[PDB]
Coordinates of C-alpha atoms and ligand atoms in Angstrom, one line a residue:
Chain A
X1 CA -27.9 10.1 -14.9
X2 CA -26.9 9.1 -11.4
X3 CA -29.8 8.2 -8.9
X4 CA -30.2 10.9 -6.2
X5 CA -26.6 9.4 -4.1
X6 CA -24.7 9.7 -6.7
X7 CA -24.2 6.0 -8.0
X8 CA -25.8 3.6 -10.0
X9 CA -25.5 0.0 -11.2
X10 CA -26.2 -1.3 -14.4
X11 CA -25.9 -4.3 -16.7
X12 CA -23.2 -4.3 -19.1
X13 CA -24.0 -5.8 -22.1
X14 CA -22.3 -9.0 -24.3
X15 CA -18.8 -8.0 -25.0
X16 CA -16.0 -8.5 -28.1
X17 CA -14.9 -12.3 -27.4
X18 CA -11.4 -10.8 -27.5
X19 CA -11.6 -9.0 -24.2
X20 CA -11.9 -11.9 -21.6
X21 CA -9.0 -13.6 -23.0
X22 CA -6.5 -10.9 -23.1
X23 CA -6.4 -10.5 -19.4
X24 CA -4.2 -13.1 -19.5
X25 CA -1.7 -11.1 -21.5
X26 CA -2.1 -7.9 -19.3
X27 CA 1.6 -7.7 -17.6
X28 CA 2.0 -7.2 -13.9
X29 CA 1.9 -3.8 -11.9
X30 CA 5.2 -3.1 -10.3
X31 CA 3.9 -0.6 -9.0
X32 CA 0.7 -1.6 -6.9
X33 CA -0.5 -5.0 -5.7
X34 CA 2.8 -6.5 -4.8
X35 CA 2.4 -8.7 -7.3
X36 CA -0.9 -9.4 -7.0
X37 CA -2.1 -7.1 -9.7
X38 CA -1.8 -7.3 -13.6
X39 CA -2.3 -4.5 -15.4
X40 CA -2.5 -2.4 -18.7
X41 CA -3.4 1.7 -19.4
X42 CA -4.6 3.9 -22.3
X43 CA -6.1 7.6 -22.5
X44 CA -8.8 8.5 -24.7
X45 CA -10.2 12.2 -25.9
X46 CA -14.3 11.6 -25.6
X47 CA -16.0 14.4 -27.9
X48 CA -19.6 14.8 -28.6
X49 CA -20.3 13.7 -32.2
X50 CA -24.1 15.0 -33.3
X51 CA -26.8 13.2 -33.1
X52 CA -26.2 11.9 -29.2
X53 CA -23.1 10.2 -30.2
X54 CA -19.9 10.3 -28.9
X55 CA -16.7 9.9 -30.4
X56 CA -13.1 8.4 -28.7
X57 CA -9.6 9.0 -29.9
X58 CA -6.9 7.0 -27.9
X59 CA -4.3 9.3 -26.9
X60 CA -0.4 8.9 -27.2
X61 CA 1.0 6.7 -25.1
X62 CA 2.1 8.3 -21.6
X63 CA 3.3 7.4 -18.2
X64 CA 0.4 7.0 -16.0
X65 CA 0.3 9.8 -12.9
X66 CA -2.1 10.1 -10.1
X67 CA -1.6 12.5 -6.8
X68 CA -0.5 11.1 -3.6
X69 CA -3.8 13.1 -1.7
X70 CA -5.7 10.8 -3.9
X71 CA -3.9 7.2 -3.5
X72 CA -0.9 7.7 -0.8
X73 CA 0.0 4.3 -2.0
X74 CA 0.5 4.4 -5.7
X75 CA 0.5 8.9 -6.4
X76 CA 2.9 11.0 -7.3
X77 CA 5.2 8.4 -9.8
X78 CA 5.5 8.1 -12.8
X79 CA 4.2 4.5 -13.8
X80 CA 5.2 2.8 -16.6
X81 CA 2.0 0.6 -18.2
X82 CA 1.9 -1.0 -21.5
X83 CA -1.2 0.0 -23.7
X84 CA -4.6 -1.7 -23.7
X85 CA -4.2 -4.0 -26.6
X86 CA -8.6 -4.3 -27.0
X87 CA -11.3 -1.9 -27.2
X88 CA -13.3 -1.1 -24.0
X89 CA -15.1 2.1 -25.9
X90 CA -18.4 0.4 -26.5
X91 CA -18.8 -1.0 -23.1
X92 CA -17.7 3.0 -22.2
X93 CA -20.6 4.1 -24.0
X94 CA -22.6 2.6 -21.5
X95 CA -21.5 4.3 -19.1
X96 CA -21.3 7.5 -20.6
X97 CA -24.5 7.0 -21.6
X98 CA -26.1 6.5 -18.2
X99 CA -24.0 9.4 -16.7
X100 CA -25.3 11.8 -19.6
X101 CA -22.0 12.9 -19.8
X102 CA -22.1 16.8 -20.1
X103 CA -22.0 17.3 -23.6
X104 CA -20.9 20.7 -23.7
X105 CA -17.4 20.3 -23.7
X106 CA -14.9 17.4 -24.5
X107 CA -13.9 14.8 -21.7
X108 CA -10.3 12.8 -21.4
X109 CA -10.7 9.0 -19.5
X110 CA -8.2 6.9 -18.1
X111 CA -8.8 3.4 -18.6
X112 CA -7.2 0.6 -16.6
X113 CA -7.4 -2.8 -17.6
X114 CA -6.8 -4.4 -13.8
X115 CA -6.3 -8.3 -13.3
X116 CA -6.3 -9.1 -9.3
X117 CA -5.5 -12.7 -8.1
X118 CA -6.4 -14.5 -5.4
X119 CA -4.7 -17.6 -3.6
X120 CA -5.4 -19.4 -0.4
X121 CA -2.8 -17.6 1.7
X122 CA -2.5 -14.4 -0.2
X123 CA -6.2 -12.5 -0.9
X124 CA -5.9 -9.8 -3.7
X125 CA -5.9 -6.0 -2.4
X126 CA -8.5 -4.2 -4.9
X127 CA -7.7 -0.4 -3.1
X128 CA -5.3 -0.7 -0.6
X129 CA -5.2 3.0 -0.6
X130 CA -8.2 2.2 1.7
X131 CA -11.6 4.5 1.2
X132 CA -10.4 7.7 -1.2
X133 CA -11.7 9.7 -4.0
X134 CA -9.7 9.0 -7.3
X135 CA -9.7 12.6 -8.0
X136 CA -11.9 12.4 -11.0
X137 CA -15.4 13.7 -12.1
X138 CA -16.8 10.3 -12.6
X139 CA -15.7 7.1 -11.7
X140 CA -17.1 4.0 -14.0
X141 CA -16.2 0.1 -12.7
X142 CA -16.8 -2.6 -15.1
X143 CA -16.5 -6.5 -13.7
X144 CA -15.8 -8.7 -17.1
X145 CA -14.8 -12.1 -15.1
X146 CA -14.4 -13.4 -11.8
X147 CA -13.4 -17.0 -11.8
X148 CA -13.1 -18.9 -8.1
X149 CA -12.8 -15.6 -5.8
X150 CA -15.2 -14.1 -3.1
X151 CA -15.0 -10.7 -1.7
X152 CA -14.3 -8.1 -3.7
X153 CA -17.2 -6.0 -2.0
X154 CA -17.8 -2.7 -3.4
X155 CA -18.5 -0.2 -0.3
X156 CA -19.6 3.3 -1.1
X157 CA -18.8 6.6 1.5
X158 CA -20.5 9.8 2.1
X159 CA -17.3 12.2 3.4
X160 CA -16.4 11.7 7.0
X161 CA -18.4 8.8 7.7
X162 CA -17.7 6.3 9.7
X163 CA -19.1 3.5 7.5
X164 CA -20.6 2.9 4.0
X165 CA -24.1 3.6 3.2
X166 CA -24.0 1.2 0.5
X167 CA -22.2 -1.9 -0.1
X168 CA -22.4 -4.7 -3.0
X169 CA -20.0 -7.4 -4.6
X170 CA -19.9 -6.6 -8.4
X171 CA -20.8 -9.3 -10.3
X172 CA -19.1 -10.4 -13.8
X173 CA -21.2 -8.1 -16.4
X174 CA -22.2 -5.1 -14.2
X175 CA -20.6 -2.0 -13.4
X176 CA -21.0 0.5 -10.7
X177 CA -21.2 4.6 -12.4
X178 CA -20.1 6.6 -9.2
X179 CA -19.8 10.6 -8.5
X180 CA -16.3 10.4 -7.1
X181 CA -16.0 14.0 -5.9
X182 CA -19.3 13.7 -4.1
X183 CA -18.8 10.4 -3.1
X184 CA -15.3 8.0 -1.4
X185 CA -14.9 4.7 -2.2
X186 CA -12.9 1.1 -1.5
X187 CA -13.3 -2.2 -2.0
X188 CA -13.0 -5.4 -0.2
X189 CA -10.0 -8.1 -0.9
X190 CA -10.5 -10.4 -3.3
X191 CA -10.5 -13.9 -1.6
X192 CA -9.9 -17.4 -3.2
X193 CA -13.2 -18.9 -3.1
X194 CA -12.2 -22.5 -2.6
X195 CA -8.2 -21.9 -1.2
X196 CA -6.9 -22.2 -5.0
X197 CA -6.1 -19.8 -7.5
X198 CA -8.8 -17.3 -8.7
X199 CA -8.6 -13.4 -10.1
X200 CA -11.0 -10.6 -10.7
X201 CA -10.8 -9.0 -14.2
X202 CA -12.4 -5.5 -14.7
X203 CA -11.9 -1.8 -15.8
X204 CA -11.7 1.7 -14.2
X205 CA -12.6 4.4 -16.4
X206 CA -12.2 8.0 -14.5
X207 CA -13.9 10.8 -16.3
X208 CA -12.7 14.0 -16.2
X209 CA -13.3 16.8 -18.5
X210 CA -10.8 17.9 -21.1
X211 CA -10.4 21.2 -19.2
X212 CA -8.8 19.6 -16.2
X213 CA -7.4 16.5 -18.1
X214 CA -5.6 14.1 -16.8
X215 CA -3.0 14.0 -19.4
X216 CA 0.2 15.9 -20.3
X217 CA 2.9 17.7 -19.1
X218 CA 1.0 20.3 -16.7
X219 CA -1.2 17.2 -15.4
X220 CA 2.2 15.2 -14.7
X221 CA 3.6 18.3 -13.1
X222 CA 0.9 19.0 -10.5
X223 CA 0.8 15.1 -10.0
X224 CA 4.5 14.7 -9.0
X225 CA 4.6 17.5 -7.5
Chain B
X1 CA 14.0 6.3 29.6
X2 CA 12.3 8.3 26.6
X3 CA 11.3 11.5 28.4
X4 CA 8.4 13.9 28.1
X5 CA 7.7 13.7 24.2
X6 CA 8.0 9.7 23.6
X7 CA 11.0 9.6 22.1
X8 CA 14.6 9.6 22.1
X9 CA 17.3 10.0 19.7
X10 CA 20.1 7.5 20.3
X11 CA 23.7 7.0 18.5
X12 CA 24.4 3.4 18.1
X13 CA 27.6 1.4 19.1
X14 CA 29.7 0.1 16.2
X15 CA 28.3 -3.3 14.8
X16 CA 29.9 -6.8 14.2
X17 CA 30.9 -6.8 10.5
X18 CA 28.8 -9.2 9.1
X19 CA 26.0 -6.6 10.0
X20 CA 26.3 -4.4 6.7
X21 CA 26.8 -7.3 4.3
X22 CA 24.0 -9.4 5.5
X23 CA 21.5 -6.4 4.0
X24 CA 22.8 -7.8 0.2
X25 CA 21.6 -11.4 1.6
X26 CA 17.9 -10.6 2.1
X27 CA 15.0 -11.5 -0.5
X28 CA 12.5 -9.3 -1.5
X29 CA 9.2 -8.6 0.3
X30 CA 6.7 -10.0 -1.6
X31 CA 4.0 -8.8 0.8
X32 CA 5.0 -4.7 0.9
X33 CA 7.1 -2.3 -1.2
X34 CA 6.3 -3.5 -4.7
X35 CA 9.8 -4.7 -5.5
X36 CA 11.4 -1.9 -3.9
X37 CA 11.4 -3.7 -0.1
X38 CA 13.9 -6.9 1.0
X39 CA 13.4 -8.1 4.2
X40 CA 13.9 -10.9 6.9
X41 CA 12.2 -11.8 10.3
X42 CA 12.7 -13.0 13.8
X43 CA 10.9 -13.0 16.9
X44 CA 12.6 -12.6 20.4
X45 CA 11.7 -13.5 24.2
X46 CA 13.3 -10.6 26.0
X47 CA 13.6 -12.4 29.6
X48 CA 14.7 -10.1 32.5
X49 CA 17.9 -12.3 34.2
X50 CA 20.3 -11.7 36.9
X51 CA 22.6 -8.6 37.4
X52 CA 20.4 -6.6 35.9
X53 CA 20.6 -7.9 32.5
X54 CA 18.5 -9.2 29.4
X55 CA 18.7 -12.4 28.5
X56 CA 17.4 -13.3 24.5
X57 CA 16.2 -16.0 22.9
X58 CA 15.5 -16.8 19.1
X59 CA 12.0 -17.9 19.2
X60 CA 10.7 -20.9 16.7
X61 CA 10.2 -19.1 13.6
X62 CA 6.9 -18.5 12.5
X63 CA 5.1 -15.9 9.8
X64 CA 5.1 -12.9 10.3
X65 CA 1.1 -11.2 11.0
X66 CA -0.2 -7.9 12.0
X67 CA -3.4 -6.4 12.4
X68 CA -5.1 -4.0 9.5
X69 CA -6.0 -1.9 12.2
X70 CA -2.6 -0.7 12.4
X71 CA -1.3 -1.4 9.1
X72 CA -4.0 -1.8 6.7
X73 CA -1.7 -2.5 3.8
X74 CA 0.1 -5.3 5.2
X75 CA -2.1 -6.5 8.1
X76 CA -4.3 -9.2 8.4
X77 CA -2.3 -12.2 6.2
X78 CA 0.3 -14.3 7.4
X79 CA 3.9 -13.0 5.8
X80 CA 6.0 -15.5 5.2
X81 CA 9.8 -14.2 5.8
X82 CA 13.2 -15.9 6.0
X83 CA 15.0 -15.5 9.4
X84 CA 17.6 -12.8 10.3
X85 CA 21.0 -14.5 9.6
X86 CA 23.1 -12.0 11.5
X87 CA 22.5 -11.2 15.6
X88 CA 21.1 -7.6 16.1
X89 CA 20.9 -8.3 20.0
X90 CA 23.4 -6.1 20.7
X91 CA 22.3 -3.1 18.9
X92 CA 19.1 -3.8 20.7
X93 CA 20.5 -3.9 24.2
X94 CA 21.1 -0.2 23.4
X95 CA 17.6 0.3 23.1
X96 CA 16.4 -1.6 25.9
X97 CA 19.0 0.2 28.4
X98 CA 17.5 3.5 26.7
X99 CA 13.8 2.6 27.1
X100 CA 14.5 1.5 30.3
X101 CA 12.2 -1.7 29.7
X102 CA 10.2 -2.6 32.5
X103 CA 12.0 -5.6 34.4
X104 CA 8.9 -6.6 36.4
X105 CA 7.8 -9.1 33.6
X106 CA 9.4 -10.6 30.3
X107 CA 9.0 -9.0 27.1
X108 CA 9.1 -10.5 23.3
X109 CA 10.2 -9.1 20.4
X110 CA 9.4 -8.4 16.8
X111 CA 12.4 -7.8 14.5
X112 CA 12.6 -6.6 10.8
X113 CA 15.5 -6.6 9.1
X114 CA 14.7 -4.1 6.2
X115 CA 16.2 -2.9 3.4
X116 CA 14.3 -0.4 1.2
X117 CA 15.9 0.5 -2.8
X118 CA 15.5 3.9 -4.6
X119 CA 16.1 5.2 -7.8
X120 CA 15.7 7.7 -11.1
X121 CA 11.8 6.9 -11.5
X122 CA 10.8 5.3 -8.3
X123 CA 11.2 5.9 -4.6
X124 CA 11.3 3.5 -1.9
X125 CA 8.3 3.9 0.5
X126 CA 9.2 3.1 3.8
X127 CA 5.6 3.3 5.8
X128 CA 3.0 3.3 3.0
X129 CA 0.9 2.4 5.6
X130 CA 0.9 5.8 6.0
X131 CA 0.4 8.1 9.4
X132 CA 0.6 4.9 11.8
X133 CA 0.8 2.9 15.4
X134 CA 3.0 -0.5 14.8
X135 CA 0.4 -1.4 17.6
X136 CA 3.0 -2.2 20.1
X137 CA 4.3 -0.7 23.8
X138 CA 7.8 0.3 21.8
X139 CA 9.6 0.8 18.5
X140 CA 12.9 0.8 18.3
X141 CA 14.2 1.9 14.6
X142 CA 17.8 1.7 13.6
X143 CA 20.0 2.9 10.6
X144 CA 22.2 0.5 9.9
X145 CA 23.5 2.0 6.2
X146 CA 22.5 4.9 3.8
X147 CA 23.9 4.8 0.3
X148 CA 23.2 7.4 -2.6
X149 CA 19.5 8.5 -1.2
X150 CA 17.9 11.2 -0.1
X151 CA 14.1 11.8 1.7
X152 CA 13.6 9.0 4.6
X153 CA 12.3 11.8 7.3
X154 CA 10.9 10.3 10.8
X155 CA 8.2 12.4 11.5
X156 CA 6.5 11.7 14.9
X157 CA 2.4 12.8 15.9
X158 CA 0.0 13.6 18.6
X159 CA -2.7 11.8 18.7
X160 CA -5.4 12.9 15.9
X161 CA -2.7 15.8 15.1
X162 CA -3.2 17.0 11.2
X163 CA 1.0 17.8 11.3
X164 CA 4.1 16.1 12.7
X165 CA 5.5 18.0 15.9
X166 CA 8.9 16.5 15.6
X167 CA 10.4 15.8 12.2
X168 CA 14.4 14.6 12.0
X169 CA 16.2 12.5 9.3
X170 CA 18.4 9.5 11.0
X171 CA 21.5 8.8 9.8
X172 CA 23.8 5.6 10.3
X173 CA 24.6 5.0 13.3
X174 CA 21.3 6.6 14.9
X175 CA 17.9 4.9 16.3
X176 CA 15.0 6.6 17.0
X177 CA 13.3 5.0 20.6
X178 CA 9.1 5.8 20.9
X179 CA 6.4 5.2 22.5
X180 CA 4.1 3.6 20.1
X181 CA 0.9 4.3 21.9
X182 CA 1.1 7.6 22.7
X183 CA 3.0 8.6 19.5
X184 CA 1.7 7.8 15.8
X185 CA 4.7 7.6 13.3
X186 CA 5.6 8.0 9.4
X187 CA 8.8 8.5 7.3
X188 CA 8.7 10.1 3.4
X189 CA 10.0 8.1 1.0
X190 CA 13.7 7.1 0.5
X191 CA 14.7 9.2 -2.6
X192 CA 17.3 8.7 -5.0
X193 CA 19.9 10.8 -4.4
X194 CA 21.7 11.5 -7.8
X195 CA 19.5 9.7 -9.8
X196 CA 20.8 6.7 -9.7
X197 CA 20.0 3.4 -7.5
X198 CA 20.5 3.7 -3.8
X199 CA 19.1 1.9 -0.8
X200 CA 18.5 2.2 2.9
X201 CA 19.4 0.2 5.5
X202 CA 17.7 -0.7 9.0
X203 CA 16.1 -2.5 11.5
X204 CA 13.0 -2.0 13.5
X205 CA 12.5 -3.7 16.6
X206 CA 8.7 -4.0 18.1
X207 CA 8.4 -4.3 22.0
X208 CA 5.7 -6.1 23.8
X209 CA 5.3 -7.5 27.3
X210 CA 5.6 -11.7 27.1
X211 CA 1.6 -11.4 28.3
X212 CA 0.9 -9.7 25.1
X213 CA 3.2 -11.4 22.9
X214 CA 2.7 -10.7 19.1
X215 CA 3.4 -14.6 18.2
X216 CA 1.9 -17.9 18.6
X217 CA -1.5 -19.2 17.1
X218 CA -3.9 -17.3 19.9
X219 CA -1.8 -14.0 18.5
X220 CA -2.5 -14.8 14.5
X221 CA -6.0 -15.8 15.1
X222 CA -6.4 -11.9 16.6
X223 CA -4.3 -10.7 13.7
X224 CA -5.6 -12.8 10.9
X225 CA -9.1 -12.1 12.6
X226 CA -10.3 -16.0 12.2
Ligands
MG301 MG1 -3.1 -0.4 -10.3
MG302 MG1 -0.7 -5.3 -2.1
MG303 MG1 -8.8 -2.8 -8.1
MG304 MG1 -6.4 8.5 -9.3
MG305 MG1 2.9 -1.8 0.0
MG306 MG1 4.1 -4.5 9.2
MG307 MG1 10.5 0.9 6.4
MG308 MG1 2.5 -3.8 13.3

């Protein structure tokens, strides 16, 4: 599991060739990014299945809710994304698998597929809820592409500090597994490398367990307040 | 002048009526709001002139740009706006004869004509920016219209404070006057008042001396840090 404070990096391994291409079909965020952002959403049951496997089940399509004490910017809505149309589960297992996700009891993930562009006057904003916990358990941050963009530096906060104790730009095939209750996080813009177009393709998965779920009615009540 | 607290409350004179219609004419923010902002932008010199009176000028119009230190969701780019069709010197005149601006040297101005859209599933945040100095002398914030919302609370803070001490919501035909240094400011979210769509009206009006003047390339080089 995590290494001691509470993050690690890995090495993501090859991926489905469907996945890099269908960030171009990923519709943009109304609701975060000003237009910046491009986005799709699904919710997936994670249950221990025997012999160290684990099992995923995508949920029924819902609304996607966060609280505003965890992103002022973009809590306490309800926002309307269309599904994931690929399958980020094995790249998941990665994660879950350096985590050792607690197999005790089920888990529920988010999973946003995020496109961020970049253009010469206009960098992308990755959190422009600034540094914040996302409210989750764990926190997993998969880059799949980066085409023409600096930035986009990952900076990691113990609470009440007054700067990061670690920093490092995610590279295309890594992702960073974070304790995001022990643990605050944001992320630098995304700038066009060269003053053209580029964009940043990855995907959040939060981790929380089933118990305290991030999905259904009671979860979008408490979230909207 | 704005008394002990910072602030003054202040009823506005009628306005010409081209005022209220213009707010239909203005695009969208691409830079803040996520759809739910429209917007246009001019800059002012504020020059003090005989009798007693202030004498404005429509400076060339440039992007508007502002530091992430005081608004970390829209600083630091250059935002490029449409100018203010309509004349809001008047309505400001109010404000300067309120603050009592200091005549002893020339002032410019930042002004943000702003409208802000609610509805059913989605309010219309007004400072997502959050708890907030504009990073001026002066704010001057003005209801021009309120149709069919709800929410839209000024609440003012102490320095540091973890809590508003002053909280009111302005209607038409009120401006709030503060001291933006000594006094951090946000407003909850326009709501939709029946459901439906509804929007909010205003303009907010940034004061700085002329020496300190939030325009020109010296000013965006700060502000852009480059
Ligand atoms: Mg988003
Ligand atoms: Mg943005
Ligand atoms: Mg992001
Ligand atoms: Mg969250
Ligand atoms: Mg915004
Ligand atoms: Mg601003
Ligand atoms: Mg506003
Ligand atoms: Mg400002």
């Amino acid at each position: 599991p995590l290494g001691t404070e509470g993050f690690t990096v890995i090495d993501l391994p090859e991926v489905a060739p469907d996945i890099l291409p269908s960030y171009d079909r990923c519709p943009v965020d109304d609701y975060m990014g000003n237009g910046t952002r491009f986005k799709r959403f699904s919710q997936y049951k994670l249950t221990p299945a025997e012999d160290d496997t684990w099992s995923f089940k995508r949920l029924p399509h819902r609304d996607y809710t966060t609280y505003k004490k965890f992103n002022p910017v973009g809590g306490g809505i309800r926002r309307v994304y269309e599904p994931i149309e690929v399958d980020f589960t094995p790249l998941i297992s990665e994660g879950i698998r350096e985590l050792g996700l607690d197999r005790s009891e089920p888990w529920q993930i988010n999973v946003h597929q995020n496109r961020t562009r970049a253009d010469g006057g206009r960098p992308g904003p990755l959190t422009p809820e600034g540094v914040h916990h996302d409210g989750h358990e764990f926190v997993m941050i998969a880059i799949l592409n980066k085409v023409n963009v600096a930035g986009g530096t990952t900076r990691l906060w113990k609470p009440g500090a007054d700067a990061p104790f670690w920093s490092g730009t995610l590279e295309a095939g890594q992702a960073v597994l974070l304790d995001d209750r022990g643990l605050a996080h944001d992320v630098t813009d995304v700038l066009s490398a060269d003053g053209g177009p580029g964009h940043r393709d990855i995907v959040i998965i939060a981790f929380s367990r089933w118990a305290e779920k991030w999905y259904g009615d009671e979860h979008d009540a408490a979230a909207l307040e």
